[PDB]
Design a protein around this ligand. Sequence first.
Ligand SMILES: [Mn+2]
Ligand SMILES: [Mn+2]
Lengths: 397, 391
Amino acid sequence: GMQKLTILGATGSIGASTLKVIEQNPDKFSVVALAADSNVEKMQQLCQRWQPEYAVMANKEAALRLKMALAVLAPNTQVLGGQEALCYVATLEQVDSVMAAIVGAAGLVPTMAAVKAGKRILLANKEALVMSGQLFIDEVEKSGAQLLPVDSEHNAIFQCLPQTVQGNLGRCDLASQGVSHILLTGSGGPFRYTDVAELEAVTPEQAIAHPNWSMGPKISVDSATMMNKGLEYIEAKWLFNASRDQLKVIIHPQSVIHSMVQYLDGSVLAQMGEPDMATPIALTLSYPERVKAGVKPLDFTQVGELTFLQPDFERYPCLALAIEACYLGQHATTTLNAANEVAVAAFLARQIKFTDIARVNDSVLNQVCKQLDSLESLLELDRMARTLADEVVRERA
Amino acid sequence: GMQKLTILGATGSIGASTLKVIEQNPDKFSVVALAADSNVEKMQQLCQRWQPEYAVMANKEAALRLKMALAVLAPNTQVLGGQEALCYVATLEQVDSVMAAIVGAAGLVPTMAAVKAGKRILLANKEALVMSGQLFIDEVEKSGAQLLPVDSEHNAIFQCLPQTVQGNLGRCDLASQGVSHILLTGSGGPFRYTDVAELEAVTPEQAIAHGPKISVDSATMMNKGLEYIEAKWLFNASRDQLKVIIHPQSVIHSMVQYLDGSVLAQMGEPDMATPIALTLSYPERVKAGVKPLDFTQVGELTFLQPDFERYPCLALAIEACYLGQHATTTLNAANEVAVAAFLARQIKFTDIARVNDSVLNQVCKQLDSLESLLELDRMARTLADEVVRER
Ligand SMILES: [Mn+2]
Ligand SMILES: [Mn+2]
């Protein structure tokens, strides 16, 4: 029957992709609420097109402007403001699924609320599992909330897993279902074939070069150091309940293959596709069925060659940090992520060298570790971590 | 749940890959019977190692020899002979699954026998579906026999498909489960990069490497065509739902394209124990004595759209596939003769497809049984014989 959605983070690209899939399947999906930050012009335009029952701006001043705009453009849309209103729409009774696409720490409480309300969670916020995986998984289990991952790699893994696993994320017994290991793939970044010696000198211009499809600058830098892959690793561990034996990382420079799973009998399954987030989003909407997504089928005439490389730690120390942190737990993953935000900004600011990103991470990470859990405890931790990082940036400058 | 097996075709490489999986899982599988043609030496060695309750040779003389041998090497084993004995072991009450790996037309009746008995069928005989797909699928439905495909490409496709489809082979509604395309892959054979003009001059020597007849079918991609035909029956696929991609490295074994843009592909080390293992273990998984895939060694993976001027046999097969059983039966019959002919040096490499095409045409210009279809096979071979001496 008809599926009711709330979309947290409707004015970004994840939101646009989600709405594209919805547009392609009018009978199947129905938008009950849309939520965003402070982009009123974009929101009003989306509310005119979609006429949702609710629209929310996190920013209360922005909510007032939208409210006035919509009084005629969308007279049946109730407009609300602030963090509490985000939780409100994420927990409505009639809502079946929630696209959790508000990014950063801002996204935690609203995402958690949907979780506690036992909703399907189309998880597109990194922080929930990077900062607070244990907490999220525990809550999911209490409420019966389904978790459907939107990140391209996690979604691909999910599709390469058998069904019994797919339905027991967070708690899955991989070995008992024949899964030897999960192979998390990534491109290796712009320095994938660059001599390690040369990394000291790298400019943000150089680190930023990417596929025609863009990324934000921070993310582009995390892709250069493979910190991005490390963060995906941490999330993967929680989504798929992966021991130190069960999760690996392979470099695949073309990114046609989006990740893979190695089974006990030697069989490997891999997911591939055109680089459009509507594919993975579509499955998070449709699971266990499939729907049109407005993505073209992959053309093997035009794919080019697919290859694989072995990462090494001299080239990608961040990845080692992340993996190490991953098995130390929430305090370490929280700490690493906080520190890395600062070091990347620092590098972009031309204050530090490219290779200084990992040093900062490492130092901060060490100190905190030498010394129950909540979203707030973790946010505080995040602040401490950022301060330590600031200090350290002063030194390496 | 100890699983009891009968292996039809135990002395070839499918038999050896099956037995390697069984060796790895002594707690779960059990060999009740082994059957083969006329390779006594290899049989007696396998019955010494496995001490099966029964052993069968299709050839009755071969059976007598084995019976003398096993009086010393497997005194407990009961040795039987002939086509009826093959059906007998394929239908035993205690047997859960039958590896159907006797090749050629010889394999039809015993494979059919297991089907009528409602057994799990680990299908490794091409002829059942190439010659008489509809019949098989119909019989499978009546008895509740499970069909599990062994061929590397079919097994990969199976893995790529969703579970509800997996459990409804022969009669699956692909489009209603989100499947747009099944992508049947193959290496393209030794002449994938060879200029078409040069095919006229090709020597059997050049058409051989790594089975002589089969090696030649790989060269012309008639082997792929036959796989295509089987794929159509296994997965209930229209021509549009079923496409062929050339993948020279054969790391990917075949793929499935979904509605939302997603593709699933199965890859692995080249060992038949992986697919066989799944046919044994489905829906669970077991060790197969195959290592995990080494991405250090895979090299580059690439892909090509096949050219039908390079591979006219493939077009014939594809055409033949949609025409029906009479056409598939005809084509396969003709191709045996043409290949033999080519090996004999009587015809050129490119003549293989001409023969096929002629025979096909004459028969086509014109209820079904295994026998009707075998007779057809005979007619087709004679027609093919005429067509040869004339070149
Ligand atoms: Mn990614
Ligand atoms: Mn093949």
